[PDB]
Amino acid sequence: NEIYQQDKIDFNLKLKTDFSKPLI
Amino acid sequence: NIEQRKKYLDITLNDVTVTCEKDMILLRKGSFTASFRIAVENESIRSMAIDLNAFEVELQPIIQYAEDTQNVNVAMMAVVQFLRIKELHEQMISKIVEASKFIRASNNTITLNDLEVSFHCYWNLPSPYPETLILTNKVQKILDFLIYQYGIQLGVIKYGSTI
Amino acid sequence: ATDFVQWENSVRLIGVSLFPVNYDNIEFMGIRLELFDELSLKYDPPFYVILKPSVKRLGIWELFKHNLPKYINIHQHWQLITKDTDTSDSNIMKFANLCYKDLLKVHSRVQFFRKLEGNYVNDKQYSLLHIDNMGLNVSFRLGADIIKIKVDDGDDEIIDCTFNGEKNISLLGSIYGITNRFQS
């Protein structure tokens, strides 16, 4: 996912969903 | 060497301009103006005042912190980074709208039938680097994973296909 | 014609700036990273990253030297942005702001618990007893109580806390919201 990695940098992107936690 | 140092500083600022007018420092970008006044007794800052001609609400959180802390560093960087991200949002929103059935619903919102995707920049104080938050009125988890897999542009577009 | 220095110093207030460095008839590119100290109301001395022209390819900058703290993943930032292939001015600024963003995060963390020194909180005086270089382990006194916290560097979240040596959960959460959790 190279595109997402670059977008995270450019946009300082923070996803609403935290995939480090369970989705119950 | 004078002229080469300006070259590197022009690169540093890119499309932003800095000007020393009186005891103020003006940050300009196409009619936008952020004025920074600082009082420097001895070799330290004792007070600071900020004035904006636009984005007063969008910048209130970080600008409020900087004034409450006299931190001109966080203040000027926040404006610079804000102007940058806002332009990135416009470009990204435009690319998605033009490349897909998504249509421009507002300054920061795109729509596809009843689906709404909104782009947000918010201040994670005390950081002067705003964070991008992309929200939807349907299934946030599917959108976020698609953005995680394919990036912002393709993630949003592919997400519209799931509706 | 001395307004230039005044103009530059104004630009430098932003915290990130490029500048040329001439050495051995080679023009190095310097990245200046300056942090404002809210306690001293002064700017700390700049950190530096120095780039040297490649002798192998045209238009390629290489990492030559730096003095950033060891908690900054400078080489991971450089590789992720440039791939040792595209070192455009745009990418260098992207690399510079990425290092500066990490510096500010640590700096702000340490400054937070030092600004509380002397201040009164919950009608109790705050005193800082210990803090590591990254501000991830902190011990402070509030009135007659001793609070010890462990912080996650990634999300600035207090993940472990002890109140007078006893496990605590009422103070967990974002690091900068701890001042509003003492009412519990």
Numbering used by the authors:
A (entry chain C): 319 to 342
B (entry chain B): 107 to 269
C (entry chain A): -1, 108 to 290
Paper text:
Kinetochores are dynamic cellular structures that connect chromosomes to microtubules. One important inner kinetochore assembly that is conserved between budding yeasts and humans (Schleiffer et al, 2012) is COMA (De Wulf et al, 2003). COMA includes the proteins “associated with microtubules and essential 1” (Ame1) (Cheeseman et al, 2002), “chromosome transmission fidelity 19” (Ctf19) (Hyland et al, 1999), “minichromosome maintenance 21” (Mcm21) (Poddar et al, 1999) and “outer kinetochore protein 1” (Okp1) (Ortiz et al, 1999). Our data suggest that the essential Okp1 subunit is a multi‐segmented nexus with distinct binding sites for Ame1, Nkp1‐Nkp2 and Ctf19‐Mcm21.
Guided by this observation, we designed an Okp1 variant (Okp1295–360) that, in addition to lacking Okp1 core and segment 3, also lacks segment 2—the Ame1 binding site. Reconstituted with Ctf19D‐RWD‐Mcm21D‐RWD, this Okp1 variant was proteolysis resistant, and we purified this minimized stable assembly homogeneously. We determined its structure with X‐ray diffraction data extending to 2.1 Å resolution. Only Okp1 residues 318–342 are structured in our crystals. Okp1 residues 319–337 interact most extensively with Ctf19 (~850 A2 of buried surface area; Movie EV1). Okp1319–337 is crescent shaped and wraps around the penultimate α‐helix (α5) of Ctf19 RWD‐C—the area most protected from deuterium exchange with bound Okp1. Segment 1 is α‐helical and lies in the cleft between Ctf19 and Mcm21, at the intersection of their D‐RWD domains. Okp1 segment 1 is followed by a short β‐strand‐like segment (residues 330–332) that wedges in the Ctf19 hydrophobic groove between α5 and β8, augmenting the β‐sheet of Ctf19 RWD‐C. Dipole–dipole interactions between the N‐terminus of the Okp1 α‐helix and the C‐terminus of Ctf19 α5 stabilize Ctf19‐Okp1. Specific Ctf19‐Okp1 interactions are of Okp1 Phe329 (a residue with a bulky hydrophobic side chain in this position is present among many budding yeasts; Figs 6E and EV5), with residues in the hydrophobic groove of Ctf19 RWD‐C and of Okp1 Asn330, which is at a distinctive kink in the structure right after segment 1 and conserved among budding yeasts, with the Ctf19 Pro236 oxygen. We observe the following interaction pairs: Mcm21_Lys189—Okp1_Glu320, Mcm21_Lys200—Okp1_Asp328 and Mcm21_Lys207—Okp1_Asn330.
